[PDB]
Design a binder for this molecule. Structure first.
Ligand SMILES: NC(=O)c1ccc[n+]([C@@H]2O[C@H](COP(=O)([O-])OP(=O)(O)OC[C@H]3O[C@@H](n4cnc5c(N)ncnc54)[C@H](O)[C@@H]3O)[C@@H](O)[C@H]2O)c1
Ligand SMILES: NC(=O)c1ccc[n+]([C@@H]2O[C@H](COP(=O)([O-])OP(=O)(O)OC[C@H]3O[C@@H](n4cnc5c(N)ncnc54)[C@H](O)[C@@H]3O)[C@@H](O)[C@H]2O)c1
Ligand SMILES: NC(=O)c1ccc[n+]([C@@H]2O[C@H](COP(=O)([O-])OP(=O)(O)OC[C@H]3O[C@@H](n4cnc5c(N)ncnc54)[C@H](O)[C@@H]3O)[C@@H](O)[C@H]2O)c1
Ligand SMILES: NC(=O)c1ccc[n+]([C@@H]2O[C@H](COP(=O)([O-])OP(=O)(O)OC[C@H]3O[C@@H](n4cnc5c(N)ncnc54)[C@H](O)[C@@H]3O)[C@@H](O)[C@H]2O)c1
Ligand SMILES: O=C[C@H](O)COP(=O)(O)O
Ligand SMILES: O=C[C@H](O)COP(=O)(O)O
Ligand SMILES: O=C[C@H](O)COP(=O)(O)O
Ligand SMILES: O=C[C@H](O)COP(=O)(O)O
Ligand SMILES: [Cl-]
Ligand code: NA
Ligand code: NA
Ligand code: NA
Ligand code: NA
Lengths: 333, 334, 333, 334
């Protein structure tokens, strides 16, 4: 069994534990956060958007017992100091939001873990994997990898189909995204100086940057430098979508685009034809859910603008992609 | 000028229209019509969950409300043909119910004795459609029914007009991220218009929905006829919206030149913003559209450019002020 | 033979009742009636913003929905007198429209051929009112129309019944902090029934509103007739509520004694909670009422005691489960 | 001449305090201190998601903001003893950070050279605690550190004082249905203070939580010492709250006697309401407490009565106005 430690027992970290409990041959030996075990256990059991944990979870001294198995709990904010080698940790899921580059994530390796998966973009010098698009770039010799962002896992399969079947000249993305924990509850100073994330999360449409489109070349080299975009955070607590407006290399119709997406569907990339809304993707296990109902092709003379839209639960969709990537990576190491 | 106005549909737009007309010279509201007793209309005029308390005096008088000392008759007749507009001497009806949005239905107010109608929505192809600050000069005063377009059209049109005038537009796709409105259900339930997405709980969901603002832009800007399309995402803010436009232009551009052109085009109708604002910051603004220079993007790949421009609007108050500006301009010509 | 149910009003309660009846053995919904095309009802049944996606299959056919492989007829007649209940062999109608909540109106279903009706709301003076787990034994089977009370009554009654049996209640005042419901407007607008407070935007406001649940408690617990009163505060959660009761008891009490008495009375209808939960944690629960022992207070000042007790309920699913329990018991008698 | 004030903690309360002091004659803010660059503080002062745009001018300068043409110094020192209050001639510090809410910690501002401090929160049992309009007469100006109590105390106290004065209170249990605040998390996450309920997503949940407002009421109304307790239910409105009190009184009472007594006690601090209002209607009000006569209830069973009284408050702006009234009164006691 591959032993996992979760660093940062937050939204992604706790959902990752839920998904890993369902995965054979991989188990979480430890979690680390900033708080006593009682707090972590409570938040694991009870979840405002993802529902009650559907298993048993009990408290023990400096440990939680999940489905009858003990998971040690630590509270050390500095990863290099954690007893990963001493516990026999194979892979750390780095989910704190504070160690999202190679140099910082490698602290887990100095602590004795064999591998790290960052639950976020990790820079250009770590292999970046959207499961179902480019996991074959891993051979197991990597030490630190990235599972990209939630938006990258939504955008990439949609962009891959467009590039493969039509060719992409260029594109601009907008993700309409659930608010997240990096926004304030009420208007207040923001630690990272972001005047827009400073604002009350559940009261506002909040423009904000995202690198998901700009960095797409790490996942789909044929799209390198061809896409850009940004985000609008809105008052849903989870559930998001990505719109892509593209110029393609050949003419296209709505029906041809939709058929190509359906033909590419998989456990990671779903295909939808129902008139759904964001609450309907909460808890889905696709990394991306293409919505054929929103496809649009604007034609003026010989020039076309193409809109394609995919949903994602930025929490659970990304988490399932993260665990698929971890499982594949763990088979290679 | 001196013109007596009646408001048909004392809803979000109708009530804010009264607030703005109370501030406008030469225009007075003589009557409102809705489906409810005067006490309910008075209460909703005084107290407003998003736009704040009415900053004037408002009192109940039998089947009338007294606003800033002046009596406004209240009617509750769902059939506009039966309203006593001729007997009250109404010059212009603001048609704000959502149920009479074409020339034939709005003309019921004329048969009822009013001289003119302004529809607070798109009004069909045989009705002039005016975005104040873009094309009010098409009005000569002889029209009987006009439209002030939609909230989204009033946001989009000044921004698209600048791009067309200064750069030329090949084509473009619009997305408006829009506050939820009264046509969505409070909780998941059957929807009278059959819309499976507006059936869903308004304050819990990102809700895709159609909009005709881009497709119909040619009624306001003829040079853009057939060049734009788009759609909407309704989201859980109770008012306050923005419109994104992704365009192909006829000449190269930088964000700085785009922003400068928008600033040079600014007016009381079309504002220019450089602050890092969010939707709550546009609630209650009186611009029809507020261009956000901080969101402009120009993507260039092999000399081929995609341009994103974004403008905010309070779909309630921005639109209402545009409606009242269009009303004043029209009323000066009748 | 299967007890055949028809649901009149395929709304929040009606659709969740179908979900629960599909899980109930020996009970099946033969038909639903509303004001709506089958395609829209099917869509609302499958996708639910607060209760989640329907777990099962649901497909469209002409004038029917097929749920778990079984056909359910859909009608659209606003006049219950004209519904074909006798022709379908309907045993019990769940009257969930909100418009036919007294004996005279609900009897339209009996003239239409149904044997019995359960109103999903208070039902007026000619109707027995049943909170399952408190007073179902008042039924003798000769009734044609009964009421399963209100959501708040099913929350309050088991808690109040324990206090009365073990301590005696002199008097009490209730406040229910209640999820907003479909009788409030989305944004400020005229309210058809003239309620100046329910006219206001539901998700933006604390909204005081009247409720007769406490004052009418004597219909369920006769010994409390005339002893309780209270009101509601509607707040911006889309489902999930709680009932606070401030009572004067006839004998001295401690927090521990009250909590133990509630636990000793727990059942499938009345749950007992000791965790620090919040409203999202009761979304979808199947208890009619969930006593929250963490909120019990007994204040003693100069030999006089005032007691606060609090129970949670999902006004949607808690009530729906109580309604179905009452339906099963009533149909067995 | 103006009383010179410094604001420590430029948060919800701190920023609204500056707004109110800018409107008050004879009081001015010389400096604010927080943990952030001036550009962030200016932005948050200008734009407010619940209280609206600042109705003045506000511009940035080097380590200063200029508000209505007057420069206000900005510091970013987390240690209050090091602030240059003596050097600026500060008369009163508003301590609004939440981190220095007792006598020993708040006295850091006195050691730093300020003459007086008002803590914007309960400050413990050894500091005088003032609800303006109830007990400001306990101050004679020789104090250095006082407390303006909590938002809930300023709501509860005027209502409870009337009941005690006119009827006598045996005991009572309070529930405040309270807007969520910044001490709750945006989404479920570990909470620094170990509160399993404030850990949960603020805008998705009814959140039970403790409050000391009723238990400490004796600091404000000594005759009620030990007679009240209560708790809070935090709910998804971003500001605007109400307090329910269920009381056992020393003599029989009717709804009319209670309501008439509240109206007779009304003032700039304690409002009297008879309209069917909801929480959004009290956002930005300047009363410390707004009694709601429509919610009064007296239940009688035999000779035993239970009395329910309810008052609204904007936990932000109502309390801020009380804080500034207390500041003004205290600074005048020379
Ligand atoms: N939430 C989403 O939609 C989402 C989607 C994809 C990726 N991500 C990424 O996942 C990461 C986590 O995001 P989240 O939403 O789970 O945030 P979160 O704030 O819910 O979780 C972060 C957790 O890390 C803990 N933590 C912080 N610093 C720590 C330290 N030094 N040592 C140990 N624990 C520490 C916090 O206590 C918290 O529990 C970020 O990189 C984020 O960008 C988030
Ligand atoms: N809300 C916005 O963002 C917005 C912006 C621009 C335009 N509009 C347009 O303005 C119109 C009104 O929208 P709203 O948001 O004010 O809706 P609303 O539902 O708040 O107001 C409509 C009012 O009309 C009344 N009404 C309905 N039928 C009536 C009849 N037959 N006779 C009299 N009164 C009747 C209703 O009682 C209600 O008070 C619609 O056409 C809408 O498209 C709305
Ligand atoms: N939602 C709750 O929390 C809750 C809890 C307990 C009881 N109730 C009660 O249950 C009833 C329904 O409440 P809801 O929240 O489900 O309301 P809802 O508005 O969601 O559903 C009512 C349904 O009845 C339909 N309908 C209306 N008139 C009809 C007619 N003449 N014939 C057939 N169908 C018709 C509507 O189209 C709608 O689908 C009410 O009596 C309510 O008080 C609701
Ligand atoms: N918000 C309310 O409803 C309300 C009502 C009454 C009283 N209060 C009380 O007022 C205080 C502030 O509450 P708030 O809601 O404004 O909180 P807030 O978090 O919005 O503001 C506190 C500010 O203090 C700053 N700060 C923190 N530590 C600091 C330090 N060491 N030095 C300088 N600045 C520091 C923070 O950056 C923040 O800007 C608390 O005591 C609170 O209990 C709040
Ligand atoms: O603390 C919150 C996390 O950083 C989540 O924010 P993100 O998913 O936007 O990076
Ligand atoms: O009832 C609500 C009105 O019809 C507003 O809806 P709309 O502005 O989306 O048309
Ligand atoms: O649609 C509205 C119904 O009457 C449900 O609301 P209620 O449960 O508050 O009666
Ligand atoms: O961080 C925010 C404030 O400390 C809120 O504190 P409060 O909830 O006690 O007002
Ligand atoms: Cl004195
Ligand atoms: Na496992
Ligand atoms: Na006027
Ligand atoms: Na069944
Ligand atoms: Na001043």
């Amino acid at each position: 069994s591959i032993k996992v430690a979760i660093n940062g027992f937050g939204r992604i970290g706790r959902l990752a534990l839920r998904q890993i409990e369902k995965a054979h041959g991989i188990e979480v030996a430890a979690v680390n956060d900033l708080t006593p075990a009682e707090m972590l256990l409570h938040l694991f059991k009870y979840d405002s958007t993802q529902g009650r944990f559907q298993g048993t979870a009990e408290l023990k001294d400096d440990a939680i017992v999940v489905n009858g198995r003990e998971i040690k709990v630590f509270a050390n904010p500095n990863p290099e100091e954690l007893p990963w080698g001493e516990l026999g940790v194979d892979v750390v899921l780095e989910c704190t939001g504070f160690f999202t580059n190679k140099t910082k994530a490698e602290a887990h390796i100095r602590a004795g873990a064999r591998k790290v998966v960052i639950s976020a973009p990790g820079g250009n010098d770590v292999k970046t994997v959207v499961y179902g698009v480019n996991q074959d770039i891993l051979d197991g010799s990597e030490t630190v990898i990235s599972a990209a962002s939630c938006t990258t896992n939504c955008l990439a399969p949609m962009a891959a189909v467009l590039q493969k079947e039509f060719g992409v000249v260029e594109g601009l993305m907008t993700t309409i995204h659930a608010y997240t924990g990096d926004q304030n509850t009420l208007d207040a100073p923001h630690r990272k100086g972001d005047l827009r994330r400073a604002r009350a999360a559940a009261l506002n449409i909040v423009p904000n940057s995202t690198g998901a489109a700009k960095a797409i070349g790490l996942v789909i080299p044929e799209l390198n430098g061809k896409l850009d975009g940004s985000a609008q955070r809105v008052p849903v607590a989870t559930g998001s979508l990505t719109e892509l407006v593209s110029v393609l290399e050949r003419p296209a119709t709505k029906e041809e685009i939709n058929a190509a997406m359906k033909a590419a569907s998989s456990e990671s990339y779903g295909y939808n034809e129902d008139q759904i809304v964001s609450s309907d993707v909460v808890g889905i296990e696709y990394g991306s859910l293409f919505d054929a109902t929103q496809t649009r092709v604007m034609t003026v003379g010989g020039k076309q603008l193409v809109k394609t839209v995919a949903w994602y639960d930025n929490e659970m969709s990304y988490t399932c992609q993260l665990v698929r990537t971890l499982e594949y990576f763990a088979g290679k190491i």
